Amino acid sequence: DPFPVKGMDAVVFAVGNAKQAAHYYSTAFGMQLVAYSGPENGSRETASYVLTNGSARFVLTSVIKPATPWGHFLADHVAEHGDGVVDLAIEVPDARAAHAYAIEHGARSVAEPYELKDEHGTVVLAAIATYGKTRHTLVDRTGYDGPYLPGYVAAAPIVEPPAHRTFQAIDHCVGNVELGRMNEWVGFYNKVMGFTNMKEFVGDDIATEYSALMSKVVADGTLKVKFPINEPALAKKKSQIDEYLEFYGGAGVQHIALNTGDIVETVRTMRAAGVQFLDTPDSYYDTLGEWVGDTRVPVDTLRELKILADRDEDGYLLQIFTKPVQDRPTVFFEIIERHGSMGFGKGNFKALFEAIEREQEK
Amino acid sequence: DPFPVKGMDAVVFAVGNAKQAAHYYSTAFGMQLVAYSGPENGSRETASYVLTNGSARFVLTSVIKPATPWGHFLADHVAEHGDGVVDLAIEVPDARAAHAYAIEHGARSVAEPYELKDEHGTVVLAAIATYGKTRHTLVDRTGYDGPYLPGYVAAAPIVEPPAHRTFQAIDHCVGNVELGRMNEWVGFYNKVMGFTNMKEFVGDDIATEYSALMSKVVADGTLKVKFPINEPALAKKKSQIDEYLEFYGGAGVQHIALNTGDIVETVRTMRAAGVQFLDTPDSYYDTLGEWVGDTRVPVDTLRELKILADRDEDGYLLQIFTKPVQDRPTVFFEIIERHGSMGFGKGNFKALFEAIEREQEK
Ligand SMILES: O=C1CCCC(=O)C1=C(O)c1ccc(C(F)(F)F)cc1[N+](=O)[O-]
Ligand SMILES: O=C1CCCC(=O)C1=C(O)c1ccc(C(F)(F)F)cc1[N+](=O)[O-]
Ligand SMILES: [Fe+2]
Numbered sequence: 001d002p003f004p005v006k007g008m009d010a011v012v013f014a015v016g017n018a019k020q021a022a023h024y025y026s027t028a029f030g031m032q033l034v035a036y037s038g039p040e041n042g043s044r045e046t047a048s049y050v051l052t053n054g055s056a057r058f059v060l061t062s063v064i065k066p067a068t069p070w071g072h073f074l075a076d077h078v079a080e081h082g083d084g085v086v087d088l089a090i091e092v093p094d095a096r097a098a099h100a101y102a103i104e105h106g107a108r109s110v111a112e113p114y115e116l117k118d119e120h121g122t123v124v125l126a127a128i129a130t131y132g133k134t135r136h137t138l139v140d141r142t143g144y145d146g147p148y149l150p151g152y153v154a155a156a157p158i159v160e161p162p163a164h165r166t167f168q169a170i171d172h173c174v175g176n177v178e179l180g181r182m183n184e185w186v187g188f189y190n191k192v193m194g195f196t197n198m199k200e201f202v203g204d205d206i207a208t209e210y211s212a213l214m215s216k217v218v219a220d221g222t223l224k225v226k227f228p229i230n231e232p233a234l235a236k237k238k239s240q241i242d243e244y245l246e247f248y249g250g251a252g253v254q255h256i257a258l259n260t261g262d263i264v265e266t267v268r269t270m271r272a273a274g275v276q277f278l279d280t281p282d283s284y285y286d287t288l289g290e291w292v293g294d295t296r297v298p299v300d301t302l303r304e305l306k307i308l309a310d311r312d313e314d315g316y317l318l319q320i321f322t323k324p325v326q327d328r329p330t331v332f333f334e335i336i337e338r339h340g341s342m343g344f345g346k347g348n349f350k351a352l353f354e355a356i357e358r359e360q361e362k
Numbered sequence: 363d364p365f366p367v368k369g370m371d372a373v374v375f376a377v378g379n380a381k382q383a384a385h386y387y388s389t390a391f392g393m394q395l396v397a398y399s400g401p402e403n404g405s406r407e408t409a410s411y412v413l414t415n416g417s418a419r420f421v422l423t424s425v426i427k428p429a430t431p432w433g434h435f436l437a438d439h440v441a442e443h444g445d446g447v448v449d450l451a452i453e454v455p456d457a458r459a460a461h462a463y464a465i466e467h468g469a470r471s472v473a474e475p476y477e478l479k480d481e482h483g484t485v486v487l488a489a490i491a492t493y494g495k496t497r498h499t500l501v502d503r504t505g506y507d508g509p510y511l512p513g514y515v516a517a518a519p520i521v522e523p524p525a526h527r528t529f530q531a532i533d534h535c536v537g538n539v540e541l542g543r544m545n546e547w548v549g550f551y552n553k554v555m556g557f558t559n560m561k562e563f564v565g566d567d568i569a570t571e572y573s574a575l576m577s578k579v580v581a582d583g584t585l586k587v588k589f590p591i592n593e594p595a596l597a598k599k600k601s602q603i604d605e606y607l608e609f610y611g612g613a614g615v616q617h618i619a620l621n622t623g624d625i626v627e628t629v630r631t632m633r634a635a636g637v638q639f640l641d642t643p644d645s646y647y648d649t650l651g652e653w654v655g656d657t658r659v660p661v662d663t664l665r666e667l668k669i670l671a672d673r674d675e676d677g678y679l680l681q682i683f684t685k686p687v688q689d690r691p692t693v694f695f696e697i698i699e700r701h702g703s704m705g706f707g708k709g710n711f712k713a714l715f716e717a718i719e720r721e722q723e724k
């Protein structure tokens with residue numbers, strides 16, 4: 001009500017080779033190029049590709065020859081953190097209202113409300129800062145009907161789209177922060193955006209023995225925009241969050257979860273298109289039926305495809321994670337098919353731990 | 363004879379994201395991953411992918427976290443020049459003999475002869491500097507039979523290979539140097555490697571009227587290794603060599619040409635796989651029959667796929683150029699099919715110029 005959001009406008013990646021990245025997400029991930037902005041249309045400093053899959057939208061920008069503060073920012077970001085997210089854009093009914101609200105409540109401004117206008121309409125943009133070097137651009141595109149944003153031109157798919165759509169929406173966007181900074185960012189979203197803490201959290205219990213991490217997730221009123229916040233935790237095993245902060249060079253987006261209507265078909269398509277996922281211990285499946293019960297996907301194909309599952313009091317979910325999409329063990333993706341569960345797979349930390357422990361006896 | 367060369371051992375690219383670059387070359391270019399070296403096998407600083415297609419071999423290397431002189435060099439090179447070639451490796455029968463010969467005749471040593479050994483044998487490596495930041499690793503792998511080089515492990519293809527092999531060898535590698543430095547570098551190969559000039563060249567006539575570039579070509583005795591050297595020239599066309607030098611930030615490899623036994627099938631596979639080639643004016647095919655004569659491929663299909671052709675006293679060749687593989691207007695590739703001609707398609711500068719002029723009048 002006081003800080004209304006319509007959903008994620010786009011996940012903007014600052015990358016070293018936008019042309020090849022756009023090819024990767026088109027083929028490996030099955031997305032489709034719909035808009036572009038570069039030298040061929042008068043935008044000489046950066047090349048920007050807009051890929052889409054249902055309502056999921058990724059923007060891949062790369063600086064050609066730095067000349068403005070933004071250009072120099074991207075160049076430095078890519079060199080320092082490697083390919084990663086710089087903007088978790090949020091669509092709002094009113095950018096000026098949202099910006100003022102966020103600033104009145106403590107947020108730091110990255111961009112004052114401004115307007116872009118072309119033959120397709122007007123778009124009001126505003127931006128505030130969140131963890132590390134990441135920002136949230138507040139986008140009011142109610143008066144625009146073009147390809148993406150004024151300055152962008154329609155573009156054709158780099159390749160034929162896959163027979164079955166790989167994904168159709170963004171479920172959640174996860175951020176990794178330093179130890180001791182989780183609750184601070186959680187409070188930030190509660191205050192600055194009027195978000196609400198969801199029931200599911202990864203507490204000290206699971207944190208120190210199975211996950212090596214603590215998490216809490218904030219979401220808007222409609223439960224569309226969901227932002228889980230991870231932080232390292234001491235366990236017997238090295239923390240994947242610490243490894244992230246170490247190789248990324250600070251706080252940043254760890255992974256983006258994408259909704260699919262058929263995770264089985266999504267994985268078959270993605271695997272054949274060249275994407276590798278995590279290797280789930282086969283013994284995980286031996287005891288899956290005992291704690292998760294029956295699923296719409298028989299255990300044999302979950303086992304064949306390395307797909308995971310989790311069950312809570314509201315239902316269940318099917319999930320799978322890709323390996324990092326760069327060489328730095330930093331950002332990766334998650335494909336998720338929900339069936340009642342509103343969780344994030346917290347039960348798999350223990351399940352996989354105990355599953356590994358018994359592969360080690362065989 | 364005093365500097366025998368077996369051919370191109372590999373063309374090593376320094377990239378910002380080796381994962382996605384390997385996927386790009388596997389899918390768009392149709393190559394297969396055969397070897398790998400990264401954190402997973404004990405090589406913590408860099409991730410390196412070896413791609414192959416016939417005798418053509420590309421090595422895509424990316425630094426994860428720089429810790430050595432080589433790692434820091436890779437990181438710097440990528441930030442300063444964008445994705446590009448850092449090594450035109452040449453296979454030799456004796457890496458020590460070749461390194462001593464090069465250094466005696468003027469070359470700057472970049473790496474003294476050293477040996478790498480593992481379960482698959484021994485390789486002797488040496489290295490000298492060429493234009494810009496490029497080097498030539500002199501490789502003696504006569505006593506090695508593994509995946510690529512000691513330290514690399516066998517790898518499976520990222521995806522299933524295309525029905526028809528896209529290309530099978532490296533025809534030539536072109537370097538772009540500054541104004542007035544062409545003859546210096548052609549001289550360098552004549553003196554340091556014993557290469558002699560081919561007759562094929564682009565000068566006075568072509569340069570200041572059609573090409574906006576001057577070019578000479580050195581080659582070894584067996585003519586397997588070919589190195590055309592380009593420099594900028596003044597015409598009423600902004601020079602593409604100037605564009606390269608400006609956005610790349612100095613001299614460096616402009617393009618690698620690749621042999622295909624069937625350019626029609628190659629272009630069909632590559633086009634469906636996502637690669638875009640230069641847009642050849644339709645009017646080029648109207649008068650093509652007049653100056654180039656009959657070809658094994660009918661003009662109707664050459665026109666459809668935008669494949670070019672050229673003829674000389676020895677025969678003809680069929681060729682096509684890809685758009686650059688990064689956002690910077692720098693490196694690109696060429697697919698070539700020879701039929702007697704020892705040329706490089708210089709006849710197409712006049713042909714394309716007049717074809718463009720014709721499409722304009724209408
Ligand atoms: O999405 C989230 C937010 C809460 C913390 C978290 O770990 C999230 C995961 O996507 C998740 C959940 C479970 C697992 C498991 F157990 F399978 F390894 C892994 C991840 N994960 O890698 O993000
Ligand atoms: O390979 C060479 C070396 C000599 C100079 C040269 O232009 C080379 C080409 O591959 C070439 C030839 C013709 C054309 C044309 F006319 F089609 F535009 C383009 C290129 N080229 O972009 O390298
Ligand atoms: Fe998740």
Ligand SMILES: [Fe+2]
Pocket residue numbers: 534536619696706
């Ligand atoms: Fe060429």
